[PDB]
Symmetry: C4
Subunit: 267 residues, 4 copies
């Protein structure tokens, strides 16, 4: 039966490399969101019975590792518009793929929310008694997108994502640096996956350590059309744009931090 599989492989073969990389980013971000947002639903819908916040940190951290193992060889497994912006800002990848990856990263993250919604369709609907509440004691929209806590304000929420994304790029840039290799080559999947693991355990209290415009805006746009309504965007004094603008500004901020102390003074 290998003759049919090889025949199907040659027909479905994609000549365009750019579209091949965008297809890998859709599945790479799908795994990250399905295994990440699905973990939140496991600890929110169960009210902590099936795990606490450490379950979210372990699943979100190791979902990046698995997403890198899946789409790393094809597209580089950027998995983040802030990460893609950092690579483009460093003259490492063409600027033409910045909107291509972002469009391919928002998708898949949007699809990953639909998979999580279909995975917990009965639990989500029975959480608030055949109704959808954006936030509160029976809030269900917090599973997909990230929302500020009661203590968090508008100014602190901006710097919460800025520091989270800057610390992500600083650690990511050191891993992907060709001249900075304190670890044998090929272990970039586990090392980058540890960065998201310690970010959730350190800066995941204010909002939910989004630090990813695709991971946040993607499922947030899904919840608007799924039935949560327009209240998703207006929650937290129009919080929806904070996990988008701030991580982009945090990427260039984290690019400068690494380059000024270690990146430029190497070799």
């Amino acid at each position: 039966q290998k003759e049919l599989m090889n025949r199907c492989g040659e027909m479905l073969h994609i000549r365009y490399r750019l579209l091949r990389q965008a297809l890998a980013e859709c599945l790479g971000t799908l795994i990250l969101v399905m295994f990440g947002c699905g973990s939140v639903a496991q600890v929110v819908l169960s009210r902590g019975t099936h795990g606490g916040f450490l379950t979210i940190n372990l699943a979100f951290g190791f979902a990046v590792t698995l997403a890198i193992l899946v789409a790393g060889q094809v597209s580089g497994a950027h998995l983040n518009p802030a990460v893609t912006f950092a690579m483009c800002f460093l003259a490492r990848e063409p600027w033409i793929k910045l909107p291509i990856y972002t469009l391919a990263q928002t998708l898949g993250a949007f699809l990953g929310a639909g998979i999580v919604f279909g995975l917990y369709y009965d639990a989500i609907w029975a959480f608030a008694g055949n109704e959808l509440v954006v936030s509160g004691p029976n809030g269900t929209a917090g599973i997909f997108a990230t929302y500020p806590s009661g203590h968090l304000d508008m100014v602190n929420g901006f710097f919460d994502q800025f520091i989270g994304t800057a610390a992500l790029i600083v650690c990511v840039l050191a891993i992907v640096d060709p001249y900075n290799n304190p670890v044998p080559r090929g272990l970039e999947a586990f090392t980058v996956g540890l960065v998201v693991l310690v970010i959730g355990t350190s800066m995941g209290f204010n909002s939910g350590y989004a630090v990813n415009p695709a991971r946040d805006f993607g499922p947030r746009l899904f919840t608007a059309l799924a039935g949560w309504g327009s209240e998703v965007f207006t929650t937290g004094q129009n919080w929806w744009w904070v996990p988008i603008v701030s991580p982009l500004l945090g990427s260039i901020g984290g690019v400068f931090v690494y380059q000024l102390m270690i990146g430029c003074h190497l070799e």
Copy 2:
């Protein structure tokens, strides 16, 4: 004394390769079930005193790694009829070993339940006061097999295992792909073990993330003969066939997902 050991080794040497691989699968699935179902008994019989659900996720995830380290070099450490079905569907392994591995995977998983039952013989019997209850406040059958929760329905339970198994095959296929190696070769034990770790932390709320017909039907058949009675099969509106049919359909579904976006468009 090495002369006797070498003499015993040559006598016990098995010429048939297929039977050698089936013998490895029996011990490979035995370790997976003994260390997996034993973890559930540690957190169910102790009522959360000796660990929560994160204990189950860590033990189930790392039991696959140890089972791969034990039987990986001999049989490939399929450890799953859905995984074996995916390999056969991809023209990677002969179809003759699909029933051979499944028979060898149900066994060992059945034996692994007996080892767990003998490990917690006093705790299981004293859990309900010298009696066996399939489900409820003193339910003991949920340690071995997986049962749906109160919120889970018949339709959602089918798609809960379908999504769990499809996400397992997608991540497994990327690891075992000869042309998709973002990680140095030989680390397949740890990478696959992380897939089960994040599946339990993401989709382990609805039923218990079976995603393995051998890991579910094996000990479930043990509980029927151990003393739990025929109520094990009739619990949850005849739930016993869901962790069997759905993961098989989820394997081919997950095979298509990986091949269409990354698998076919490689090299």
Copy 3:
């Protein structure tokens, strides 16, 4: 100042290899017990405030990895009389070092208890109000040695350690097998450290997953002389000999299990 260090190194150089390996086993078991029994004191004296049972599993599992990294190159990091008995039974190491390693493993484990006692000297004494209680609500002897639970009986306690040690040897033998290498060579520290991690999360409910005569009898003998009295040995219907006799019988039982299915039918 390197001249003095090199001069001191040549003077202190040990010609005897057997005594060099015994010295490594004393420090190897010291790290395992200090980081293992110290973890129990962190969650028992704090009444779960500074960690649950998962803290014990992670610390005990990763203490074996660090002890292997410290004494692996010198003595092989057996760290267990049952493991040493398995190697001697397999004609891999001389029988002369079976009592030498056991004497060197009981020591260090005894010293590791003294370090833990001095680490938590104030917490241990203030736990019961300037008194030492072997077991109960204010029990402090359970930190060092392992004691059966209320549900555990004499017969089940024997098979609890037998299954725990047999599963340890089966996974250890597959790692140290020269012809069974599904993982790149040199990762034996992390792979063996995962075996103890999943044993604590699976079979650590009945008694405390001793599965190590040196790790159990060592600090238990320390508690008798530290002030706990002879009640340590008579607790649990003379439980002290169960974590000694059973793991030794479980090592040869686990040796046969691996050899009959995978060990003999290799290459």
Copy 4:
């Protein structure tokens, strides 16, 4: 745009190697403190809702791994004056960089506290109602620096840090030993990161497993100027000097322990 980046790289290039290593230590300790002290604020300000003590252990343990991945190739990622003192005492690194690294390690740790303070500015101020309390039910100074518990005394606190640092150097020396390599070269980031993980789970109950004069005195000096006042230094019967003097004495104590049993008797 690569022409501008290369032009900027040559201008910003640093000729002095010693200043290049000090710049790496500032960012290396910054990551360790930002991801370490930020984890404490995640579990203290949330009152355990967003994680327990295991969150601190995982974040502190893996922050050393990420800090080594960032500054390991440049300065060696000492990250600890006790570690730097151990290297200088072993005639491995020049004594001239002992005050240079310590000054560069206190900084960054001081800056890491400011980043954590700005990350949780609203949560810290709202924790005690627009006020700063050093210790108590609303204590906020314990996030940055380490303070003794109620049971801990002056004598035990000295030996709590002595044992913690000695066990750290013993495990660190075995990893960085050129002649003691039971693990493939290059995995020093993960192996050292496991040492801090098991130290927090074993000896992190008495004070908070400081075992690092830079990680403790750095943010402690920040809290004095941030608004906590001079009570930070006088808390716990002048505890501030214990995490400074004791780890330095524990480094040479741990140097002797490893050298006498394994270090000297090698090759």
